[PDB]
Amino acid sequence: WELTILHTNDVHSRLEQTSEDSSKCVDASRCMGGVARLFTKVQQIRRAEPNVLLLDAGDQYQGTIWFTVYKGAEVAHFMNALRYDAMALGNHEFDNGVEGLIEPLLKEAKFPILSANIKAKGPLASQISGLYLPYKVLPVGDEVVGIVGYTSKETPFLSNPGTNLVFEDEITALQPEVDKLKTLNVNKIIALGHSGFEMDKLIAQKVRGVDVVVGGHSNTFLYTGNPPSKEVPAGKYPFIVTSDDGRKVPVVQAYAFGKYLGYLKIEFDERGNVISSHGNPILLDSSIPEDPSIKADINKWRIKLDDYSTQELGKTIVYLDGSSQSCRFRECNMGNLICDAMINNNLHVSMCILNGGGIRSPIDERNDGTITWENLAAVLPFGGTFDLVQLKGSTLKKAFEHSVHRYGQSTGEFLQVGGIHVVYDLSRKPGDRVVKLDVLCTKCRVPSYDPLKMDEVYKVILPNFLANGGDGFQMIKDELLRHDSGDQDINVVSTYISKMKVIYPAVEGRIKFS
Amino acid sequence: WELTILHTNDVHSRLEQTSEDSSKCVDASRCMGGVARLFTKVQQIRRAEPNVLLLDAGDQYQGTIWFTVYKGAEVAHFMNALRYDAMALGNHEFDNGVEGLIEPLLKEAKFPILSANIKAKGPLASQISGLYLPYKVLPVGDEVVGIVGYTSKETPFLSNPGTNLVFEDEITALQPEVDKLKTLNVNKIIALGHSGFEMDKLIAQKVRGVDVVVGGHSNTFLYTGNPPSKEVPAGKYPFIVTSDDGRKVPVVQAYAFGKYLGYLKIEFDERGNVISSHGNPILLDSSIPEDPSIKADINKWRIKLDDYSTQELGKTIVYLDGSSQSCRFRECNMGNLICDAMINNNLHVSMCILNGGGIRSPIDERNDGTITWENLAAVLPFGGTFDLVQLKGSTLKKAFEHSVHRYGQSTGEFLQVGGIHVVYDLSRKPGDRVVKLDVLCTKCRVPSYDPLKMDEVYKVILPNFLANGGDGFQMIKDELLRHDSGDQDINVVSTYISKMKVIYPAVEGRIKFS
């Protein structure tokens, strides 16, 4: 018995087709993804294959003006029109709190929403009871497939789920749920969730009875053969894990932003054993036409969003690189721009630090360089604040050592800077990679760069996320000597662009490697 | 017979008292120089000494809003009120051409104006005949003192004297004039002129009959003992040169901007031989009160100049270091600001070069950081243009080697930059001191720094002065592949400050030493 699993993850409000880098579609002839194109491809596979499941591994929430305005109502609506079979909750599904998850999505989805390791307590338990489920048994032709969900244990430190939700260890919460399915004679079981590729491999290894793992959270691109675009595969598709009980368990993920439709075909025997599996994610490029019905419905919902692109804030004559392959690995000019807007809005305060993972989109300059509220909303969608903090020289040095402690994994903690000249030597031991750290003086008439002093104290502008110890910056939350709340992140950057009129940030050598 | 020589040079329109750095007087209690303070001190010496000569060694012209507006009429007027005895022509006396020298100064001075090496030809010879003289024999008590003038041979490459004035070698033109004085039995001879300290020493050495050399042009500070301010002496005051005929010839200079009054007492015998000489420049600080009559006359002329300080263009929160001890020796933030205004006014063009000698004043930030047209007029008083030029990588490298070829002499050719990261190793041979030269790409979507290529061509914004081979940049004039005239220097910087509203340029590492 053959099963076709179609899967998306980390779509992040890319409801309309996008540029190849996932920013706003400017050149329509080479645009990618979007729910209208996704619908065409799914439909084509549903005609060809009898046993199809369309799954989402979370993080449909947050990313573009679509979510800023519609707050998840667009997610429920367009996921229903695509006839998704199930969805696992991701961390961004808690961004507007539990109320922002319950009212627009949990109450409006025509498909089960899953998570087995999320436990509700206190006054919330009675309110959220049954709105999400640990698992769902789905009829697929003449058989049944059991789907178990899971969500990142790190959600309380990444989002706003509130104090009445407990995020348990995925493996500990999944085993009794999979055990329960085996007793109801469900012999085909998919673990669908949002904890990242490393957790996905461990669940494949440790949770007895799991046949396939469909994941997300780490924007993992997997491919067999020659990749069709910019994305470099982290492994073969499917990634095979040998479980502790000796089974070959396929592990799948499909990057992010709706650029690819994950596609895996599994051959099961009558007892639910996996004989074989094969596939690859499908590039949703311009060769696949957008569905007309879905596009016309998208264009209806698009009307209300047009007042966020009517006003021109300013222009860029440079590509504004807010891509994760740049901003999580080296100095990126989107990072320099945002840090220059942070220092400019506060002017003394000479220094800025900004987690690269907080930059969520590039901005393309070819649209006659137009920067709208819509372009900026994709770069900074969280609605955070840029705060002033007082730090020891020693604390700041620990922060920069933390910035590169596990360098090479596309982790969000890599810092973009302003008024700081840092030099890293990656050949050195974690916690000892900063070889040079020069800072801009504040107690001088002519600002210039001098080596940071451990026994000195400095004023730093940074996101409140970092001031509260986000991204593992425990030393900042713990060791800060003063904290003042600042202005709204998007307004800081918007005011600066308007002031400059035309912007051209460069990669200047604020961050170097030795 | 004892003679007191009081002398000024390179006053450069500092008619009013200034800050210690020679910019606008903000804190009156610690202000310096000015013609009112100069008058008090001269008067005090005239009461004490019977044989006094008040001399000016040129460059009274150009420097502040006083010259921009009054065009030399203020020079004639205030030099007359101070009762100067003679003045040698400097290069800045030709800035408004010969017409701008003849009508406001040559026709209005109540004292002889001198230069023996300037020869008029063509239709100009009959117009300027007798308006300036090669020498003047002056009665001083019961004796006569002969004063011979000279002007820098480099004036045609520094100013606008036109095509009808020939600047001959100083020594060749001075000897027959001094010879003529010896025949009229003038046995006391002062060479007063504007060619710089190195020429002054050579004239002292080579021109037979010259008793003393009173110079200017090189802003040379000379002192015996412990200096009273920021200025570091280049030697003792007077600087002694032994002439080829065996005489001890004192050589004097008094820095610039009217901060010091040069003071030299010479003991002559009845035959005009110099027995002895001694003195030192006098710091014209707040301890010397400004003359009330002169101050009230200054305040009368000050009224018309107040409409250049009424409008606030913007604010600075940093000291804007346009001092020659910074801008001719290392990266200075006034240089970075002007280069950022040059690139901003033209935006591709990514690179800027600016001769440090072209920056003529700092701007102080303590006046609530106010930047007026008057502050800017002292920084950029020449009214030049910032032009676009196309240069070979090899040409640009030659220019940067020229920039530091004779480093250490406070020479104007040292370049301030924009979109360029240069590293110098001064321990190396002239013409081979550039060890690193990285430039900002133009043919890229994300601007970043890459090593300059010799066989590549680049668009550079620079002053027309440099595009015409000024400051010995013969390779720029000779090797440029394209030249386009730009916008007026002061307007470029003014428009940029207005756009920024608040400025804070730093010293960033655009220029480094290895």
Ligand SMILES: C[C@H](Nc1cc(Cl)nc2c1cnn2[C@@H]1O[C@H](COP(=O)(O)CP(=O)(O)O)[C@@H](O)[C@H]1O)c1ccccc1F
């Ligand atoms: C302020 C707070 N949260 C944040 C503020 C800022 Cl400035 N950055 C943040 C977060 C959370 N994560 N991050 C970065 O995202 C990266 C992870 O991204 P990823 O690899 O693509 C996988 P993900 O898609 O699940 O995020 C982290 O490493 C962090 O750098 C919030 C408040 C209201 C709404 C939504 C919010 F998030």
Ligand SMILES: C[C@H](Nc1cc(Cl)nc2c1cnn2[C@@H]1O[C@H](COP(=O)(O)CP(=O)(O)O)[C@@H](O)[C@H]1O)c1ccccc1F
């Ligand atoms: C454009 C042209 N000239 C110039 C334009 C620019 Cl951008 N810079 C210039 C000049 C001339 N000199 N300079 C710098 O001044 C330095 C010399 O200064 P100094 O040591 O203080 C002794 P100085 O007082 O006699 O100048 C030179 O080395 C050069 O760097 C002009 C046109 C109309 C009016 C007045 C002009 F000059």
Ligand SMILES: [Ca+2]
């Ligand atoms: Ca099974």
Ligand SMILES: [Ca+2]
């Ligand atoms: Ca003599």
Ligand SMILES: [Zn+2]
């Ligand atoms: Zn995500």
Ligand SMILES: [Zn+2]
């Ligand atoms: Zn996630």
Ligand SMILES: [Zn+2]
């Ligand atoms: Zn001068």
Ligand SMILES: [Zn+2]
């Ligand atoms: Zn001069």
